[PDB]
Design a protein around this ligand. Structure first.
Ligand SMILES: CS(=O)(=O)Nc1cccc(C(=O)Nc2ccc(S(=O)(=O)N3CCN(c4cc(Cl)cc(Cl)c4)CC3)cc2)c1
Ligand SMILES: CS(=O)(=O)Nc1cccc(C(=O)Nc2ccc(S(=O)(=O)N3CCN(c4cc(Cl)cc(Cl)c4)CC3)cc2)c1
Ligand SMILES: [Mn+2]
Ligand SMILES: [Mn+2]
Ligand SMILES: [Mn+2]
Ligand SMILES: [Mn+2]
Lengths: 227, 227
């Protein structure tokens, strides 16, 4: 089984979610062939140099899973797009592109975070355009941490996918399977893409529950678990 | 694993749901310790004497599962409260009460259809009161089928659970686990009952997806599958 999670929004304020996640990595995840984290692992990220102890707890727990022979992958979300190569090294996680097309035991599956599909949010697409320009990233990161923190804190209902952008994405990739998070509305959806039945499996956020998508040679399941 | 499904709303108009259900009984269900169907197996029921061929296909598929050594149980829903002992015999399914308290591998779980929890629907509780009076049932059933059909067809958004009725029910049973359908909003909910954390796992309707709850010594999962 290949596992997909997303939208853990981990943070110091919510340590129950953290312990939930550690129990999942210590347990379920070990038996997996691979684990993909499709973004919003962290509620916020201001750079890999952040000393926040949570960052190292997590990277440590994930690394042990990779050290167990189970490869962990990451796609960025809107919350944690600044996660970088140093965090990758600490956690043993391989960073991936915003869209990937997997071959899962013969089945071709498109994964992303899901936020690029929410094209009816004009104004988020402004924000995203800008925070993805390298030189805006490099600028932000070369500030000193204490100012990054102040910029973050001073910055204080999720628009669902545009249906057409979903089709276009599954058609651009010629796939009948899509897995994403971001929208926080866990569900299996049916649609038409490439003139055939297609499915969009949506992961949920981790609050009271956790969730995952489990892909096998024969099946694709979306699973909710309580803690 | 003990499986719980509900809300298949099976009917001649939707044969894809039927084939989906047959594939589940032929496959997943065989490996189970037991299968509980928590109501709305059928979109409508006017009595066990109905010759509708779908009724016998289904009873046949279920019976093979029981004949495989996997006990199947049924709680009535609002749609199929007239399912009776003859259908039980044809299908090998044991009929159960509207609430049961199970011991699942040491864990005490309340199951019901879920409609009795929707107490803010004044007017459904009228309908239910009446159609559950024996002599109103016996009257209806002693009509001739052709008139039952006409009464049914002439009869042509689901109110969610009242939160307090949920607590009261879990408290009446002294349980920290509840499984039900009816509301068609699949989810895991956290709450307080008996002054402890409790969980309410809700099954979904079968349309594009199927769903089930899988209970093991260690875990309670809600699973969506596509067809
Ligand atoms: C579609 S939606 O997601 O529902 N709504 C929506 C709309 C607009 C923005 C967002 C959103 O994610 N905002 C957001 C807010 C804070 C954060 S953060 O992790 O605290 N952090 C990320 C890095 N930020 C940053 C700031 C600058 Cl100066 C330049 C660059 Cl490079 C990055 C500073 C703040 C990350 C993201 C969310
Ligand atoms: C809360 S809700 O479910 O969202 N809304 C709601 C409100 C009120 C009623 C219902 C509802 O389930 N109606 C309903 C309609 C039809 C059916 S049925 O299966 O076709 N069938 C059941 C048996 N019926 C019957 C009729 C009489 Cl004369 C006496 C008796 Cl003994 C039974 C005849 C009709 C079964 C149920 C649903
Ligand atoms: Mn998210
Ligand atoms: Mn997101
Ligand atoms: Mn129903
Ligand atoms: Mn119902």
């Amino acid at each position: 089984a290949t596992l997909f999670i997303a939208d853990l929004h981990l943070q110091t304020e919510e340590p129950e979610i953290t312990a939930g996640f550690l129990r999942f990595l210590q347990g379920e995840a070990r038996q997996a062939d691979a684990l993909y984290i499709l973004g919003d692992l962290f509620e916020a990220w201001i750079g890999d140099d952040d000393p926040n102890p949570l960052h190292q707890q997590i990277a440590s727990a994930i690394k042990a899973v990779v050290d167990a022979g189970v490869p962990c992958y990451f796609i960025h979300g809107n919350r944690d797009f600044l996660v970088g190569q140093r965090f990758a090294r600490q956690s043993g996680m391989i960073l991936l592109a915003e869209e990937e097309r997997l071959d899962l035991y013969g089945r071709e599956v498109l994964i992303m975070h899901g936020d690029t599909l929410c094209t009816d949010d004009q104004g988020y697409l402004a924000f995203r355009a800008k925070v993805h320009t390298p030189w805006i990233q490099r600028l932000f990161l070369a500030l000193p941490l204490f100012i990054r923190h102040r910029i973050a804190a001073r910055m204080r209902e999720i628009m669902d996918v545009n249906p057409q952008a979903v089709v276009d994405a599954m058609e651009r990739h010629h796939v009948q399977w899509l897995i994403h998070g971001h929208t926080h509305r866990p569900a299996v959806h049916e649609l038409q893409a490439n003139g055939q039945p297609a499915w969009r499996v949506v992961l949920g956020a981790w609050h009271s529950e956790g969730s995952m998508v489990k892909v096998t040679p024969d099946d694709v399941e979306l699973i909710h678990f309580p803690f």
